[PDB]
Amino acid sequence: PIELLPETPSQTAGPYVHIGLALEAAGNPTRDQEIWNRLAKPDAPGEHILLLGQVYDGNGHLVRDSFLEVWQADANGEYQDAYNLENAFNSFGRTATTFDAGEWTLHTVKPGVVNNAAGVPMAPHINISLFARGINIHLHTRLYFDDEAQANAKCPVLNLIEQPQRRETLIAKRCEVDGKTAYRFDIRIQGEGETVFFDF
Amino acid sequence: PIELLPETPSQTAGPYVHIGLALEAAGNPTRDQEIWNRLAKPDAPGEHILLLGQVYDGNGHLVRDSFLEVWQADANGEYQDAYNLENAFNSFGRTATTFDAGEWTLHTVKPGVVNNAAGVPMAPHINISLFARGINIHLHTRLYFDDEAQANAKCPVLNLIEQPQRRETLIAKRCEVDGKTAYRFDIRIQGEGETVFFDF
Amino acid sequence: PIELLPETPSQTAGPYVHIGLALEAAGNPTRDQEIWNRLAKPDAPGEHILLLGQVYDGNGHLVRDSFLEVWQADANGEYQDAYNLENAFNSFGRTATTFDAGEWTLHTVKPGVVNNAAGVPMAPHINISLFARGINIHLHTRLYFDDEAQANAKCPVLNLIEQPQRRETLIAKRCEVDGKTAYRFDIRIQGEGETVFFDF
Amino acid sequence: PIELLPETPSQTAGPYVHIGLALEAAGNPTRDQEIWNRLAKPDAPGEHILLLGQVYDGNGHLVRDSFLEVWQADANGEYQDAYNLENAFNSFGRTATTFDAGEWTLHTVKPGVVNNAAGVPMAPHINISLFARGINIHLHTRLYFDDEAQANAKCPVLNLIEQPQRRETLIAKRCEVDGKTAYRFDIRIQGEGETVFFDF
Amino acid sequence: PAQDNSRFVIRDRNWHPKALTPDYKTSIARSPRQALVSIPQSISETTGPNFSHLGFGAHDHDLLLNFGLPIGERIIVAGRVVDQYGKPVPNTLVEMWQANAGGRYRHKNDRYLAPLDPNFGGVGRCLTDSDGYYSFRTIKPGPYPWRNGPNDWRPAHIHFGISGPSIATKLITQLYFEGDPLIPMCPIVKSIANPEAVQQLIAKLDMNNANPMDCLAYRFDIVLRGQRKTHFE
Amino acid sequence: PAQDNSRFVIRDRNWHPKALTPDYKTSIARSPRQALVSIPQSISETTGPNFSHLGFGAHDHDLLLNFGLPIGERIIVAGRVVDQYGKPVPNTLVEMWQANAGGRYRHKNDRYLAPLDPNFGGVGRCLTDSDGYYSFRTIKPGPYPWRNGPNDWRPAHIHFGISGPSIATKLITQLYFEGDPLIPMCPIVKSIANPEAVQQLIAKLDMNNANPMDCLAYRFDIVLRGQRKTHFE
Amino acid sequence: PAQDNSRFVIRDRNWHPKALTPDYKTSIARSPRQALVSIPQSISETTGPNFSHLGFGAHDHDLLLNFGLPIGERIIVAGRVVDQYGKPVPNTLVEMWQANAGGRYRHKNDRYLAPLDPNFGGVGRCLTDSDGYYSFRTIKPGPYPWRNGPNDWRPAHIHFGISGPSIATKLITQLYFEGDPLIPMCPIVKSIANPEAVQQLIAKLDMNNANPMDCLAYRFDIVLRGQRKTHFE
Numbered sequence A, B, C, D: 001p002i003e004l005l006p007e008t009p010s011q012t013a014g015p016y017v018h019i020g021l022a023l024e025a026a027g028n029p030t031r032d033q034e035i036w037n038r039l040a041k042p043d044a045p046g047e048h049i050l051l052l053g054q055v056y057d058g059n060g061h062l063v064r065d066s067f068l069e070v071w072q073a074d075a076n077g078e079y080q081d082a083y084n085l086e087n088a089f090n091s092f093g094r095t096a097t098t099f100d101a102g103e104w105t106l107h108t109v110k111p112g113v114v115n116n117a118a119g120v121p122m123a124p125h126i127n128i129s130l131f132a133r134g135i136n137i138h139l140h141t142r143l144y145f146d147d148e149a150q151a152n153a154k155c156p157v158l159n160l161i162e163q164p165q166r167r168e169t170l171i172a173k174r175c176e177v178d179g180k181t182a183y184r185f186d187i188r189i190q191g192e193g194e195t196v197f198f199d200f
Numbered sequence E, F, G: 001p002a003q004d005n006s007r008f009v010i011r012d013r014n015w016h017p018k019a020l021t022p023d024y025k026t027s028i029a030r031s032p033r034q035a036l037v038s039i040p041q042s043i044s045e046t047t048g049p050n051f052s053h054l055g056f057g058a059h060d061h062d063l064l065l066n067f068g069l070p071i072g073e074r075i076i077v078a079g080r081v082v083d084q085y086g087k088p089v090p091n092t093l094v095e096m097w098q099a100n101a102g103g104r105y106r107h108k109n110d111r112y113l114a115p116l117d118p119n120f121g122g123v124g125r126c127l128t129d130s131d132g133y134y135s136f137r138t139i140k141p142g143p144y145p146w147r148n149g150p151n152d153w154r155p156a157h158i159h160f161g162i163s164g165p166s167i168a169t170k171l172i173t174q175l176y177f178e179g180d181p182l183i184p185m186c187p188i189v190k191s192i193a194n195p196e197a198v199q200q201l202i203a204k205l206d207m208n209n210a211n212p213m214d215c216l217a218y219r220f221d222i223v224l225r226g227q228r229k230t231h232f233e
């Protein structure tokens, strides 16, 4: 058969990932421009939300050195790939869990609907990549919203998960923080209630 | 790099280990001098205690053919290496679990404090080696006492265990047997409440 | 390590090199345009000079089949790379030693000062490449002028030569030929007074 | 045939030899005890002398980074191998050439006579080992004295040198420095008047 | 907005290190036990951020000046980012981080006894050029002891992060130095089963890229997933 | 009392059998799922008992006389206990146990149909000499059937327990006999991943140590963790 | 006084580097053109100084403290000094010198742009013990660019000087680090014709001698000329 060049192999990010990808967190001076956790500026169209979560290992312990990267469409369900600190909205962000509480936060807007390759609409979702010490190759997942039951039920992606019980692991629970709309998305790397991770 | 002679590979002690190291238990006649579970003669200094416990497998079933070896300092925090049946106190002892009840016992004194290599005092502890059928290479653990919480909190060794909840597995629970001071120390080889095993 | 394609290996120019690069000297008819020893047209700016010299072997005998190539800046310390017979001045020229007297000559102007990579000015010099039978790979040298002692003393290049006495070998001695300013530059390939050859 | 283990191969001392073997010279702080150029203390028996010399390369240039080690008998022609800063005489010394003048000095006493293995007396001599940058493996030589013509003529070692002219290269010329008896011993590594170097 | 015009060659999960590699202790509790769910590529996965307009500072890629001169072996780390087809990946973000010359990281959590270097930070970022070339200037990091086995030491390494054209191509990896005797002993390195895969992680000494009497150079090329146009979909 | 004057070379957990070796059925539920926690060596780990004053019986090491003459092949099992540095381990405790000529153990729990040997116990103990030498006199044990797979047979073996200078060096192992065809089919033997490690478990026939017209001999040397003095601590 | 009781195995001048090795520029003018004159061994050559009574300071052999903690890879350099017969050389002087972590020497004449380390000198001395063992504690030196060819760089190396029992055995050499890609490219290294001789100069990573979570170790054994008693002379 035909063999191409092999992709460079992945390696864990390690516990010091912060010095390189989350300077503040590393407790180091930042540069003029940094990619962080604020995807939308106050004057950005769409419904402003706060996302927050915790990451658990197989023993039920918090993963305090985790690093996450997100990719989502804007409120119009469009991907803004031209990253710029001047934008009112950036489709991409970076976040990490506190060495203390071990919770991550992201300031964004609820994503608009996008169609799959076959033209079927997918429920509003946020693409997540999780990196950390002990993680050889990053994990891919999706965050869906509990208040989008109707859409969620019809998602061509959610429906690829054989066991309905497993689908619930991708649904973020709507809450309120300081009187602001928030959604909680906890990730269980291993064991009971283990979060669905994708390959693509 | 520099390579030394390889150490002889370990093998399971097997289910008949008693024939060689726990004669009485094998149901065989003993020899004049045997190494057993009575580390201290009644006339030995320090706080005389009785230690007892069970060993569980990954299914929560009792391990009735387990063999244990102990090493501890005397009441002055001193290791008495010259093994002699005439001594009032010996630092080394052997014990095994009943084929019936599956409980092991040891008669000794509460160990004194010893300093680590850096000069930091470790909380009073007993070094344990667990052998048994299905165990290819023996397991190393330490027994700590629940009435020494202060020292325990500052132990350089206990503190190397990342998760606080895992440190609890090494703490023996004080009780009384026939009006005598006893500490119960159960070992969970695998699963829920799995005991901390070391490498050194 | 990283290995590139190997450079084509050098070979001696041979004793008949003239047939290809010094037509007139071979005793052959020349072509319309030839690269020769007249770098400057009489109407060229700067101090017009005549350069001449001999080449000696390790026995002190004349090398009468030697071929030389020169590269120098104009009177403004500028390299004119666009070779054209119409230019008043060309940075590149070719010369050769007489099969009889064994002397080479060159008609040019005194070169202006150029700075090294670090921004330090080098004393006025002419870059020379010596080819000839018995010479497997060409020799690199520089011609400096004796009436520029000040600049010479501060040359970053001249100063890389450990022994002061060796630096003298690169200094051409001012004279006059037919009432014209001339500099004599003899090359000793080997032995007593051996000329400094470079690698770069 | 029989082959033993091969001796570790020699390597040049390099130009920085001083940081390790001649701290002062390196321009670094010295330690309490250093092996230097004063073999005898004023109260040492024998005729006190000053040795001095220069080292030349094949181009007749000074070798300013040379390092020499000497070994000689005392005035009684006895080797004092027990090195001690408290001794009135030490058989061993270290010296180096000045980065400036490029001259080395040694303060010692004229050596007594010693017999070869066959019982034949050798003329008073000093054993020298020369180390430096460009020197792959150190050079062995001997320093003899011009005022010991009689002995010199009969030396079993000097007489092993086939050409009488070559023998003169090992004879130090007696002089006076500040009204003190001195001997000059110049070493020519290569070329004209090349000093005799030994293998043993 | 980004558009779904590409497809990426499926990852070879047998080439890459598996999740569960027990010699690397922490991977025990941080690896899923359930199988990964395969999904078709969509705009969500085939797109990613472009960092062309990020405001990079002048010494972003020069660790010798971006934080006195650091103590350690001055080196240049350069290479090219290509896809599995051999096609260059221009205007892509390349980020790196490492320890100092002594194996000490400038991070809260680093308690290794080797001292910090007052003139060294340990972070760099570079956008690849039209030909997919990137380059950094730094000092060669030192081996780092870590609490794994009783005597585990990480080979000198530099952490690399590469974005590529999509979130599908995004990768985090590590560079090792040619000839390091520690390489074959590292549990993290060994997380990779194929010895051939390990070789792709070793930067080669590059004398041709070295600055005489200044600094040495190492070549490190990175291959991202092959990008192709959709067909008969 | 004992003193913290030594350090022991770290164990190679890839040389020794791993905890979970599924073909050896019982190991499934008796192997930890959490990684071992590595700890620095202290006086606790670098010291151990000295059995020099233990009151050994005169026939402690002679299985022929320590329990009629047993039926089976009369053999001497001798060897030396050294450390990884090749240094002898004198005055150390070596204990052994085994079955009779028929594969029957003198143990309650042994219900194998082969009968017991009235003149055979199957236990011995020996304290190595100044040179690290030990020796036992016994009869060659027979293969033993066990409930693992439906037709598993343990090769003839002798169980060994060695103390060494500390609890850090203490070891339990098994000796196998040169040329035994069962060796390579045993699930327990197979717990050892490296064929080279298995080789260390095989006693070689030693005609030089045999007593003509009496008994054969087998040589079994044991290597305990290398011991070194502390330095720059 | 010393006495003529020994004879030393003649040096193999084909094993050692020759005088004239043109790739190493400076050797051109610093090599004799006349043949060396062979001479029989006498008391002059078979004796040498004993340094047993030299007053060594406490940190003579510890470069980490003998001059703040230096920046660089903390390592231990240990080994044994033996003769060609394999016999140890006790109470012998071993001296060493090197550059800092960045390739900078603390010497007037060093103009390399890498900076000096305020806490590092670069000199050590150690007297071997009864078994011929020596040990040093320092930081791994960095490669050093030098004016030879236009792009020559010395591999990381440590200069060693060893006295031995006589002036006949005295030697100056250099230690190189296992796996250094620069080794085979060095004109000084290449002064040695036999590849097998080059191997004796490469210190091997010694994990067994390493101080966990502290510093690594390298093993470097030195062989001096064989010493024998005179016979039928």
Ligand SMILES: O=C(O)Cc1ccc(O)c(O)c1
Binding pocket: A012, A013, A014, A015, A016, A133, A134, E026, E144, E146, E154, E159, E188
């Ligand atoms: O704990 C781990 O995951 C291994 C490890 C530790 C420190 C590092 O800097 C690193 O790159 C990898």
Ligand SMILES: O=C(O)Cc1ccc(O)c(O)c1
Binding pocket: B012, B013, B014, B015, B016, B133, B134, F026, F144, F146, F154, F159, F188
């Ligand atoms: O069940 C097991 O662990 C295998 C086994 C059985 C009997 C033995 O004597 C023995 O040495 C090993």
Ligand SMILES: O=C(O)Cc1ccc(O)c(O)c1
Binding pocket: C012, C013, C014, C015, C016, C133, C134
């Ligand atoms: O004398 C020599 O250098 C050899 C030689 C002779 C004639 C040639 O044409 C030639 O190419 C080379």
Ligand SMILES: O=C(O)Cc1ccc(O)c(O)c1
Binding pocket: D012, D013, D014, D015, D016, D133, D134, G026, G144, G146, G154, G159, G188
């Ligand atoms: O010039 C030379 O002889 C080569 C060289 C230069 C500097 C050094 O430190 C060294 O050890 C060797």
Ligand SMILES: [Fe+3]
Binding pocket: A014, A016, E154, E157, E159
């Ligand atoms: Fe790292």
Ligand SMILES: [Fe+3]
Binding pocket: B014, B016, F154, F157, F159
């Ligand atoms: Fe058995």
Ligand SMILES: [Fe+3]
Binding pocket: C014, C016
């Ligand atoms: Fe030709």
Ligand SMILES: [Fe+3]
Binding pocket: D014, D016, G154, G157, G159
């Ligand atoms: Fe050097």
